[PDB]
């Protein structure tokens, strides 16, 4: 029954042009490792990719990363169509331009720095309209294929003339920034991402089909751990990967508002969320709004708490809204909020272990050129106790150090910026200052 | 030992007259309760796996290798030339990159000239001639590109180019062979 | 300093005849790997061992297993002298006999089952008086070297005639039983063992020297976790390995007015009587549970005695107190504050690696068929604790026995030795896991 | 490399050098220095097991390289059932197969079947393609020999004392 009908899954392989199938699925479609494939989603936008096998796929799965998902306008869980495409002719010439909000601060030869090494004997299949991403010079640049010859698809071969003169282009409305947070931006949280996806993915992604299965969705999820372990990261990534709307409430910020104004902002948040459903409301620092208090005689339940409980109890499944809250410890919070139907699910987003830190360091160095003496495992071993934010800062600091060792303005030449190698000494520097500037440089 | 059964094909030998595959209905792309049940099931068992954190056992690793070598005792390789000609040959999984290079050398116009073999993307050169096709993941059917330091456009033995076949005729040759014939 | 002075450390190699040294130490002593060495502790009882290199120990360390430590009568941390022993003659003849309490219920040919394969072209160095361990037939038999020719040590060579007729010999009081619990009996607690050693090894082992370095000893230690994770086992091993006397107090038993505080006081008095000692209170919560409210309520007479006995132990007494409980919150907070049980260690549920290690410990004495895949068993036992795993192995062994039957108070050694435990026996045990015959003591 | 083959036998030993090595009681006495050193290691092992660091690719590669530079030469001893020892110098990258060839070329009867093993417990060296570094027969290692039912007779007549063989090794290892 429909062998060519596949279900979108997340990539292990992080190359733009690559998708993965199970071998039995490749047998069935008579594909070779390395073959070009033509793919379509519901919106019926096409993509051309190279197919590899994967040992960890279910037969109906197609593993693809965010570049290909965006090009196809699909999300994890969606249906795609696969057909062979050996027709693809070699390109005479192509026209690619950077997207504006990705090249702010840089000048010079984008061909030499990004495009030349990217296409170099890679024989990459491309499609008119594709957005693709190239990493380099402390930055991830996004390029759009404006035109190809032949059209609409070709293989960028050694003879293919690559044209990239012209102004940077405007990002289109449905074209999602690859700068937006997704699952590939989260390290050391495999277990917890799996726990959260199991709870919220289907309710948010397919509300009607979910109801038909009959199991009750969570209403509130409590994420806990120390500051900077990636709680906001996770909730934001889930919102993006599911297509759900994201409304952030800052605890202390809403409490700073005058008596009366707090409660109304709280209501507006929920209304806004219900309005743009499916949605995630994220309450950062929940303990600022509803702390656990000691039993005092004649203590009246804080207006704000009463209001939050009313909103929680009032969210029917058909509202398609899930509430997430961040705290340091579950016991820091009013027990009324933790009773069934409210925040009855909790997920420990704790301090990462050595493997976790390695993954986090690799995420935050992925746009940097690292010298061969850079040993991230060693850096991970030396950062016991560091959380995600500490490690992201550490990487910014190592990079700032490399820049100080070389070069001030609001503009940098691409070739200069690209010549920067962050060394192990730069990390050792950042390590010695670690305790848990220029406009053209955007640091994670 | 292994019959290489060498053939050459070129994309310019496809027929280009027959109809396109039928367009898919809108329902194809529509998700069902069954799809959602399967996804949930996958999420559930991935969660379990990560909570339990089982060992990847020696027995499991050895059985996985053993099953793959039994399931795919024969390998189809395709070497793609800069001019778009493809040379196709049959190998064993236990044979080597070196064997592949020899095969390519056997069918070159100038057997003396220097070439490298790689997979893409990204460009990944096959520099270890001792690596077996199984180890290199050139298995059970894999596509390899050819490059030369000085691209002098001869490459393949011109007598073979006379007998070049269509890509889809080459595919049939592979299907027949893989069903053990 | 003096290159022949080494410090006894725990072994990675389980073999009776093997000690390990760092490669720089072997370079210094000009030792070939596989060469014979001669060893002495302070009691001057010597041992002859084969030496191997180990990549993890520091230069002054000698890694040796418990069999070797008992033979040298040393403990972890003690000093040994090492000298090359190239002059070891091949035995003309030797005499070895089983220790009585290890061979109960066994009859028949001990030589063929245990001794012959153990020595067969193994060229083992042995010393008169040596006790050594041969595993087999779901059992660990201990043997003593009664005589050697030549004396007092030789290599057991192919030409060496091995005599072993005679009566099973009595254990000596100075001879520590290898059936006593040690570190090598504990799996999946490598972290917690280290945490506990750091706290107690030195104060228990060298009281005088410990107080000299200024640091204060731990007063009371709280081990917590679900039942059967090895809290008793750990405390026992620490006592045995440090030479400390061990006193078990069973909480529930003591709680079942009057005679309770008599037992408590005497337990403490007996401990300092035999110092250095560990006092182990199993299920502390049974004695001092967390009380709710009780404002003008008098402290229980039992809880009071315990605080008196505990506060009445100065560093001078050489006693450390250990308690088992499930959760630290189930205990009265008066005990959990400084000067009492101010230190705590989590002996929690083992992971997959942990489980495999426990399974390896409790299958040591079984012959396992080639199809037995203990990693698979570890993978299929998520949630299991040490005690569950020990029971599982026991069920697998009995299943093997069931399949073979024989009945009596006695079994032939060769019969018992032909028992292979197969994967199907573990599948049975697995299916029956839900957390008889006198000639067989199962783990 | 040239093996510099030498044969020794314990019945050719000529020295009873320095025996009354009577060792004082305080040699075995533990000092404050000893106790502190033990505590350091315990603390060190507690920290490592708590922090559970990675064993890194760079560390693993550094150890291999550091040992192959520290010990470029290997001395092997093959001990025969008649207590004769055959000694030969080797390189760590050389194989168990080479060792067997060394032995064979010095046997009285080269067509005779033999096996090499380490002990205890008895472990036969079956993988002839395994290097001496991989076999852990390195930097100086004792190997035994057995047969199903031996050294060239001319070679036995030039046999030296074990202690003389030892000094040859020390001098070769520098
Ligand atoms: N697990 C992680 N993986 C990758 N980056 C992380 C992680 N945790 C934190 N970071 C980095 O530091 C920031 C952490 O902030 P945040 O997500 O607000 O943590 P929390 O919500 O726990 O306070 C993120 O924006 C990200 O750049
Ligand atoms: N970590 C472990 N390694 C090996 N065996 C164990 C372990 N934990 C428990 N066992 C087995 O379970 C038995 C009972 O353990 P015990 O020390 O009484 O546990 P607890 O005191 O935590 O209840 C032990 O005698 C031992 O056989
Ligand atoms: Mg925060
Ligand atoms: Mg218990």
Numbering used by the authors:
A (entry chain B): 21 to 427, 433 to 461, 473 to 480
B (entry chain A): 317 to 497
C (entry chain D): 21 to 276, 279 to 427, 432 to 461, 473 to 480
D (entry chain C): 318 to 466, 471 to 495
Sentences copied from the publication:
The AAA+ ATPase p97, also known as VCP (valosin-containing protein) in mammals or Cdc48 in yeast, is a homohexameric ring-shaped molecular machine that together with partner proteins controls a plethora of essential cellular processes such as ubiquitin-dependent protein degradation, maintenance of quality control or homotypic membrane fusion. It comprises four domains: a flexible N-terminal domain (N), two AAA+ ATPase domains (D1 and D2) and an unstructured C-terminal tail1920. p97 is an essential protein, with orthologues in archaea and all eukaryotes. Biochemical and structural studies revealed that a C-terminal fragment of ASPL is necessary and sufficient for p97 binding. This fragment causes efficient p97 hexamer disassembly and spontaneous formation of a heterotetrameric p97:ASPL protein complex.
To examine the molecular details of the interaction between p97 and ASPL, we determined the crystal structure of an ADP-bound p97-ND1 fragment in complex with ASPL-C at 2.46 Å resolution using molecular replacement. Two molecules each of p97-ND1 and ASPL-C were present in the asymmetric unit of the crystal, forming a compact heterotetrameric p97-ND1:ASPL-C protein complex. Two heterodimeric p97-ND1:ASPL-C units were found to be interlocked with each other, forming a central cavity with a diameter of ∼17 Å. Two such heterodimeric units are assembled via a second interaction interface of 700 Å2 including many polar and van der Waals interactions. The conserved UBX-domain core (residues 390–466) in ASPL-C, which forms a β-grasp fold, is also similar to previously reported structures of UBX domains in other p97-binding proteins such as p47 (r.m.s.d.=1.7 Å), FAF1 (r.m.s.d.=1.6 Å) and Npl4 (r.m.s.d.=2.2 Å). However, we found that the N- and C-terminal regions of the UBX domain in ASPL-C contain unique structural extensions, which were not observed in previously reported UBX-domain-containing proteins. It shows that the α-helical lariat directly targets the D1:D1 interprotomer interface in p97 hexamers, a region critical for hexamer stability, suggesting that it might play an important role in the dissociation of p97 homohexamers.
